[PDB]
Assembly symmetry: C4
Homo-oligomer: 460 residues x 4
Amino acid sequence: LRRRLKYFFMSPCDKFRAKGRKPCKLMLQVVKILVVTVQLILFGLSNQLAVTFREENTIAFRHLFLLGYSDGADDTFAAYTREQLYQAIFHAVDQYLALPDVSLGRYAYVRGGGDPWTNGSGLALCQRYYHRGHVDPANDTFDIDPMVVTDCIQVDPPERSSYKNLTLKFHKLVNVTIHFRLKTINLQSLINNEIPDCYTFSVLITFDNKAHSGRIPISLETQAHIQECKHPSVSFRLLFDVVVILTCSLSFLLCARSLLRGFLLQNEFVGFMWRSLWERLEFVNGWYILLVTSDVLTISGTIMKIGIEAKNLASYDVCSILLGTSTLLVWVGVIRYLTFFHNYNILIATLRVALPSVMRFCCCVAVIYLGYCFCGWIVLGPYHVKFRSLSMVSECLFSLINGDDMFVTFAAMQAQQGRSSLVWLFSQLYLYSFISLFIYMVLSLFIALITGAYDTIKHP
Amino acid sequence: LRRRLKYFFMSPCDKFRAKGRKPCKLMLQVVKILVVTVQLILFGLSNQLAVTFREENTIAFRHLFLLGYSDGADDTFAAYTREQLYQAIFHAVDQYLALPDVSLGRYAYVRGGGDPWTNGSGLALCQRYYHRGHVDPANDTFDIDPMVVTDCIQVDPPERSSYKNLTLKFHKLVNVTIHFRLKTINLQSLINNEIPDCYTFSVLITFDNKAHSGRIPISLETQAHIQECKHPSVSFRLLFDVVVILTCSLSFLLCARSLLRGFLLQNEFVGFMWRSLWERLEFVNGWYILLVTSDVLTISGTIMKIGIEAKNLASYDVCSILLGTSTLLVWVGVIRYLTFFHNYNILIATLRVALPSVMRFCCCVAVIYLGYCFCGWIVLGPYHVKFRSLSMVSECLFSLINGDDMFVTFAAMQAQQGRSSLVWLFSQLYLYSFISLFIYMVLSLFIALITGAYDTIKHP
Amino acid sequence: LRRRLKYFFMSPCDKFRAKGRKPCKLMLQVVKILVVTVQLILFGLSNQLAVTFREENTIAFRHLFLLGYSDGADDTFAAYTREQLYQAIFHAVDQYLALPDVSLGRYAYVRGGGDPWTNGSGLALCQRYYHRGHVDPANDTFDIDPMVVTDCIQVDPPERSSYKNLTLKFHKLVNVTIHFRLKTINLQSLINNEIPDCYTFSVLITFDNKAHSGRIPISLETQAHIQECKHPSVSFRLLFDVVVILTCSLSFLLCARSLLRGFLLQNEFVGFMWRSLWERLEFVNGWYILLVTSDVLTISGTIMKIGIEAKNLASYDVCSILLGTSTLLVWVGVIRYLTFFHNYNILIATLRVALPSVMRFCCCVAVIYLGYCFCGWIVLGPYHVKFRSLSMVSECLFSLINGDDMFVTFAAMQAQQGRSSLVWLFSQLYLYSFISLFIYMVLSLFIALITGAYDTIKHP
Amino acid sequence: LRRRLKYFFMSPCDKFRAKGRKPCKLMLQVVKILVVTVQLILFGLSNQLAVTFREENTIAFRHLFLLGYSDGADDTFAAYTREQLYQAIFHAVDQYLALPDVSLGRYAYVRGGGDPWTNGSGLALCQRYYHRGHVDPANDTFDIDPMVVTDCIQVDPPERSSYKNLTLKFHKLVNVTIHFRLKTINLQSLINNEIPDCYTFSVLITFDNKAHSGRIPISLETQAHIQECKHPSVSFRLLFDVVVILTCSLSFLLCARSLLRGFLLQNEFVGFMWRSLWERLEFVNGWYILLVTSDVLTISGTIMKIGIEAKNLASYDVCSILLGTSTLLVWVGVIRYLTFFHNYNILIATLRVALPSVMRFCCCVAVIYLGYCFCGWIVLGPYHVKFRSLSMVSECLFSLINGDDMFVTFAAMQAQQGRSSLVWLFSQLYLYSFISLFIYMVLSLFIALITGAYDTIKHP
Ligand SMILES: CCCCCCCC(=O)OC[C@H](COP(=O)(O)O[C@@H]1[C@H](O)[C@H](OP(=O)(O)O)[C@@H](O)[C@H](OP(=O)(O)O)[C@H]1O)OC(=O)CCCCCCC
Ligand SMILES: CCCCCCCC(=O)OC[C@H](COP(=O)(O)O[C@@H]1[C@H](O)[C@H](OP(=O)(O)O)[C@@H](O)[C@H](OP(=O)(O)O)[C@H]1O)OC(=O)CCCCCCC
Ligand SMILES: CCCCCCCC(=O)OC[C@H](COP(=O)(O)O[C@@H]1[C@H](O)[C@H](OP(=O)(O)O)[C@@H](O)[C@H](OP(=O)(O)O)[C@H]1O)OC(=O)CCCCCCC
Ligand SMILES: CC(=O)c1ccc2c(c1)CC[C@@H]1[C@@H]2CC[C@]2(C)[C@@H](O)CC[C@@H]12
Ligand SMILES: CCCCCCCCCC
Ligand SMILES: CCCCCCCCCC
Ligand SMILES: CCCCCCCCCC
Ligand SMILES: CCCCCCCCCC
């Protein structure tokens, strides 16, 4: 048992020296790192092109259909008069009807296909307003049934104008929407030696009046559905994916075998000694847990990627998250190889022994941080753009801790002095106290904890 | 006495072990944290909607009434010619008269109600100029009586033009103002399942000529008065408020009882020993002082909030400050619970022992900081936008200490080299010396103080 | 001797205990701090108003005289076609002639007064071009006499058009300038209860063609000459100045007496002991040297300020620098009072003992910094806007050391990848190595020096 | 042998004391620093003027030839309709033909000279489109031969319109280009007392349609070819260059002699002792290796510079890199002089002993950093502009480590909450974990390493 336990906790070099077993797992892990990184790089390069295609088409749509649109004005684009709104709506519909003769892209119309489109209709122009709305601010009276009624006009694309009779119910209007679909072919794919695929863009233009504040924001959004073109006329992507799957499966099997052997040795040692939990889990190789997790994530992400590349899925986010997290874990696992050398192991052990106190001090920091977040949100939110939501407040405070965007934060409040002197003085005290406390004391204590851990490692 | 003193300074767990008294106060404080945080979250969510409504209405007013206005131009919006000013004023008044037919919002006119409006008048167009003004820069002569005279034209809203004869006294003009009120109903409230309230916006448009510099800034400001609509036709908010008040009152009573018992024990101990002050106040539980302060603040803020939600008050700033500070204090009080565990108490005690020297070094830093503030204000203020006011100078220097906005600060001065070589060289020396001194030495000394405190704690 | 030496190096409290002499100098220094700070605050408040007046007038002039000018476009404002230049020049002159009927300010014309104006002319429109210029890029030939010839047209202001025959020598044009003066009265002074003064603005509009690059930048500059108006009809500022002068003179006399006392005692001690220099200068009170310097600076600045407020001088920069530096020094001198208390003296002595090593390490840092500055200037200057001049390069590197403007610096180079791959790779290596070296090692060594100094102080 | 070894490792002052040999090499190195710095400064000043000339001409070209162009719009400038593209192309050609009468600069036309221009043609207007292109998105069909066909129209400059019949093949268009050359003389050179040289700008305007996304970006680029003008009519630059070459050659010879001395002494010592490598290379003077490298770099760069100033080369980048790196190395070499003084040697030795552990920890950091880079690139790239490329991701993460651009990074993701909740939550976790880990632990460990090195140096 003692000999076996000594072998189990032996370094790979010393294990090779003792039993002469070949280090298959180490080479397998190196090859796994290489192939996983290559797969991720190829996937990212492939996806960036589709992202660019969709974004460029959407920008072109914004320039084509939004009256008076200019780049960088998406957040403030809005109508303020009734004639402005009518002109915007009519311009959008007229551009839809004129698209074949004006657009630099090649687009095909789509008709029918269910709501909001009737059969043979390409564009749906709908206004949504309250079922009954009586508003008399003069008498301070109102009678509203909040049930929403939708009225849609259907426009058929031209073969190569009742929508002009639209009458908006301004006082009870909830919103206006324009819906239409356009088909295009992604020729750019030829640059990557891929077969072009067929895109259908569903375009939704929203004139939003849910605030009833006299300002109606205007926005354009697109959803892209990608298919394989039914008659395209212009293998080393699936093969690499199955290679990755096989590599990860072999790694998983070997790591599971190692973990099982560790568990069996733990049970044997406990039984022998009996003739604590923190000492029982000392037999657990955490690096192998990390490798098993990475293998599972990589296999799942590779299956999802194979499905996506065949156009049988559109869950890009989940697959990307899985593969990216797996790549991060496999690259973090390289620290294990450095731990076998004394000079690198000094630094890694310093971090390891520092980690618990760092976590506890993070717990101590969190409550003060949350109190400051709530106070800033409630007090400064009505006045400061960076304090409107709790997550935004947390982001602003975290940036201030790191010395970013400090002066603009102060200046936004400076722009409201004299108006509310009490609020300005409170903001001064709040910001100064928070930043001073966090930079003079908290970061210093983190430094002190790390320094103490390093000293403990260097002078045992 | 010795047994009672031992019990008094005993931890809650050990107090429970000794006497068995239930820890009512601890559970009460946990529940207090929960309910206070929930109250603050609900209040902030409610207030953000009103803030958004007011801001959107004001933006719509700026787009409706200010000739040639565009987003982001508030700071520089100004007139420079007489015809520009006339066109702006006439456009504002014409838009006021045309509002019902052009505006996307629904607004009602207000008439009379005292100054500056006569009875039956909706819009007041007033010009203020010196009583006697004779200015002859050709002869370098002037005769001015600085008494201000106001001339107001009253415009009645249309029923669904003497203001065009306005003649401005340009050489003696102090300013021009346009005042009018608009009534609207906040329908957006239905999204939160609230009854819509009735807003009256008082709109003031100012063309300011108090600098007499040939540039007249133009601004629009709104004040919102919120009432309950007199005939609206579309309980678990006041109940939670009284629950919060009761919880805080119980906490206050228990904490006051504990403090009174501590004072009595202190008096008994002093009397017995006599048969200092720093040792006499060791009987004071500062956490209970903080809890009592938080309870008082929360009760006051909750009363003010109840009044506000009934439309009986409009002091949002004071109530928000009270509630936010109380929430901050209750969340800071959570540190006490961590103090009962040794590993967290190490960090908290490190901070506690470091605090006095940190405060003394802050005092040492303050005088140097103030000297730099004054010098930079006097020298760089005529040339640098960030140095025009002392508070602005302090904010800029504090941001520089933290590594924010450094390059733009240098570049603003770079943009004036050659013009004033002496000033540019002085700015170079000033900025470089300040930043170098503060980053190489001051922050380092704060780090050293914290590290020494941590070492003292770890090696007693 | 020994008793006198003991007394000389005694603290003010112990000196009072021993001899009982009143601490006149300490109270004098406190009063000096107060009065100097008040003087600086009043001076800055007074000067800011004049700065604002001049800046607003200049902005109004830019909006009045520059064709197509808009705020924020000063840096890029330029002409690119011949008709653009003609239109700009003619617009400027026409606006000059139309000023009385269009301007919101009140201005008077100035005539004569020497070059560039003849007698009775208000506006001078001058074009400067080479004496002989023959340029034939088709044949790659040129014959230029670089002597500059100036041709000026004089325009008389109207009484309440040969300049339209201007013919520019485009191929040999050096520049075009428009010069004119405007008189105005600063009424805004009444806000501060000051008597309005009379301003003369000299306005220079430059169309610059010294690059001969097809792009002619256009700029407007003003110089303000301030006088007292010769017939204005609408003491506690000079009295405070003489009070400040008297306070500083008394402080100077007392400090000089103390320094003479120290020198005499040093001479006596040296003579007695003889019956080194670093030990001989230990008798010097550096705080009194600083106080004497501040007194001299304050007296000089107060004299200059008295002259300025009488309109007898216009050297605002020198006076402001003197007074600001004096205020900085007097506020730094407050550290001496903290030096008398042990807990503050610990921190001050830590800084004092650290300072020499900090200076030596700054010397070590300077050479590496200069090498990086030169390399970045020569390599990145042709491509990076922030690297065009050596001072700009130094400012950029200093900001990078402190963690400011890093990403924009990287992105400016990113915007030129592919064009010059070698330069982009070099910039990557340069920036990464510089920042890593300075953050990982240099700042850490400064921290280590300060920490070692603090440890030496705490454990003697 | 012992005396010789003692002399070899002796300081220059002690070598002078022992043998009396004059310190020629030290004075030579000082003079080398001076002359190299002067050469670099003169070269940079000379090159900046040419850079400015080229950039100003290119800006003028953008304003002249790009329809509706404005400053700061280079990245977003693009066409979106067919008539927009036609107008832009025709405007460019019309401005080319009208240049002599409208331009503020003086330009000469160039004809012939090879592709893409025929003989006697000044402007080439070429459209590139696929050989065969049939795109039917309605039927989801396409037949494309990806061979590119180019059709060019030649425009002869006017003597002091078939291009209007251009018909673009929009559905198969790859791009459109306009090529033309202009000759000009750089008169600005006279300011620096230089003979003006003759520039030929080759101007390429690209309307790019390689994405086929309905948005066609428009760009203008210039390449400058500089010659001596064949008949110009208006020595202490080459002399200084040969002086620099001679100084560097003498330094190289002396340093090589010293290194040969060291090698011979090393061999003699090894032979004697035999009667290791890390001890064998202790005989190598690394400062002399650095000096030899700097001498070689400076000589090569000076030869390249001599060629460039004669207009026999145009490889500015390589010469600038060589000279800048050499200047950086010579300025770094100044540290050697400080190493001879104990107080400076303390700091330098601290850095020296810290360097190995710093490098090892950099190796440890690199793998985690790369994992984060890959994960962020794959996950956030589709949504975040700063994450589109791996180098961009690395730059963003490095800036975040230093506290720069943090809030904008958070806000870009905030602008997409609700759309993809999973991606937003992942971005929150990713950013917070990365920044917290790197600021709390990594930088702290660097500080600890430097502090430990300093303590080891101070307490041997
Ligand atoms: C009649 C009024 C009753 C008010 C009840 C209010 C609601 C309720 O549960 O309060 C719980 C509190 C306990 O209050 P609570 O604060 O939870 O309990 C005290 C704290 O633990 C205190 O420690 P620190 O907080 O660290 O100082 C400790 O020294 C005291 O010991 P001691 O016993 O020797 O004084 C405890 O009594 O106990 C009462 O208030 C009286 C008990 C009931 C007596 C009934 C008499 C009819
Ligand atoms: C006649 C001219 C009078 C000028 C008065 C000016 C206005 C006024 O109150 O000055 C106060 C100063 C005190 O000046 P002051 O600086 O406050 O006092 C000195 C400092 O405390 C000094 O310490 P350090 O500052 O740390 O070096 C100490 O060594 C000297 O001891 P010593 O006595 O052994 O020299 C003190 O005299 O004392 C006079 O100046 C003479 C006293 C009056 C003699 C009257 C003779 C008729
Ligand atoms: C004939 C060629 C002459 C070339 C002269 C070139 C121009 C000139 O002044 O060089 C100065 C150098 C001195 O060169 P320099 O480098 O200044 O001097 C040497 C360094 O101080 C070296 O220390 P490190 O640099 O720290 O390694 C030391 O060990 C050598 O000791 P050593 O004497 O025992 O070898 C010195 O000679 O000395 C010559 O080069 C030969 C002297 C003249 C012999 C004349 C013979 C006719
Ligand atoms: C070339 C140039 O314009 C220029 C500007 C500033 C500085 C230098 C050169 C070299 C020394 C530098 C200094 C800025 C401030 C420092 C970085 C100090 O913190 C230490 C060394 C200093
Ligand atoms: C022997 C146990 C070591 C476990 C290390 C796991 C590291 C995980 C980093 C995310
Ligand atoms: C036993 C006394 C402890 C007092 C701690 C109070 C903390 C207040 C933080 C704002
Ligand atoms: C006793 C000598 C002390 C001198 C201190 C001077 C401080 C000057 C700071 C600018
Ligand atoms: C005696 C060996 C010392 C070598 C120092 C070289 C420094 C190079 C810095 C780039």
